A paper describes a structure:
The C-terminal portion of [name] is comprised of two β-sheets preceded by a long helix. This helix extends from the top of the O-layer through the central chamber into the I-layer of the OMCC. The C-terminal portion of CagY is structurally similar to VirB10 and TraF homologs, and the C-terminal portion of [name] is structurally similar to VirB9 and TraO homologs. Both CagY and [name] are much larger in size than characterized VirB/Tra homologs, and correspondingly, [name] has a long α-helix that is absent in the structures of TraO or VirB9 (4, 5). Analysis of the 5.4 Å structure suggests that the connection between OMCC and PRC may occur by contacts between the 14 α-helices extending from the N-terminus of [name] and the 17 unidentified α-helices extending up from the PRC. The tips of these α-helices are presumed to be flexible, since the corresponding densities are not well defined in the higher resolution maps.
The [name] Cag [name] is of particular interest because of its role in translocating CagA (a bacterial oncoprotein) into host cells, an important step in gastric cancer pathogenesis. Here we report the use of single particle cryo-EM to determine the structure of a transmembrane Cag [name] complex extracted and purified from [name]. The structure can be divided into three major regions: the OMCC, a periplasmic ring complex (PRC), and a central stalk. The OMCC has a structural organization markedly different from that of [name] OMCCs in other species, and there is an unexpected symmetry mismatch between the 14-fold-symmetric OMCC and a contiguous 17-fold-symmetric PRC.
Author numbering:
A (entry chain S): 349 to 510
B (entry chain R): 419 to 510
The structure:
Amino acid sequence: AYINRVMMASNEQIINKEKIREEKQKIILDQAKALETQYVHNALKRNPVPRNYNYYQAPEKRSKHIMPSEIFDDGTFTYFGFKNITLQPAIFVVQPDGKLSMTDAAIDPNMTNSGLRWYRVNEIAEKFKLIKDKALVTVINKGYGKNPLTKNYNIKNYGELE
Amino acid sequence: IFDDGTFTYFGFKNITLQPAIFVVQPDGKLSMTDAAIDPNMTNSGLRWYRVNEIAEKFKLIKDKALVTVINKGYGKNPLTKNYNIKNYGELE
């Protein structure tokens, strides 16, 4: 009866406490990973703060089914707010020679302020045509260049880089 | 706008757009030069845009709007002679 080898089979309690050590290290590591990706996913699409409101509009003729309602910006993007009884125009940025420029745009699904349909464009300019085939309406930015940003890289100013 | 004797750093706002920069050749013609937005410089909250030449007139051209930059400090402070941008340079 050599019970001493059973006692020398207790060097894996060192292995036991070290695997509990690296396991709680693993749990705190991926818990910090999940926490920070929760934060950077929550504060990536949060909301934009508005920057200026000084927007006028001028419809030509029978542009009531195309007229925007509440328009503002954030210094980077311009948020148009339509009703739902209105249709969806083709938005255009007036180039400073007077010509037009088709820009990328999307209906923003996150914003539902005041029960509108929000539609952002990715430019800040002074005149915006909203054109369907005959009806159109021109939006005049009388707050152009009054409140810009200083300089940033991401939409919210908690930005990442590599 | 400033320079370092080798590169010329333009500093834009962000409400402005991004022109096509051009170096005026001394006959009066233009010359497209290589340029890049410098990501390291964020002085005064601007968009820095360096070109790789030192000249006297710089056109900044989009389709109808343009602006001419006049170097009234051209050739007043050059370098002596160097090989790299910072003067701790390597060679083989």
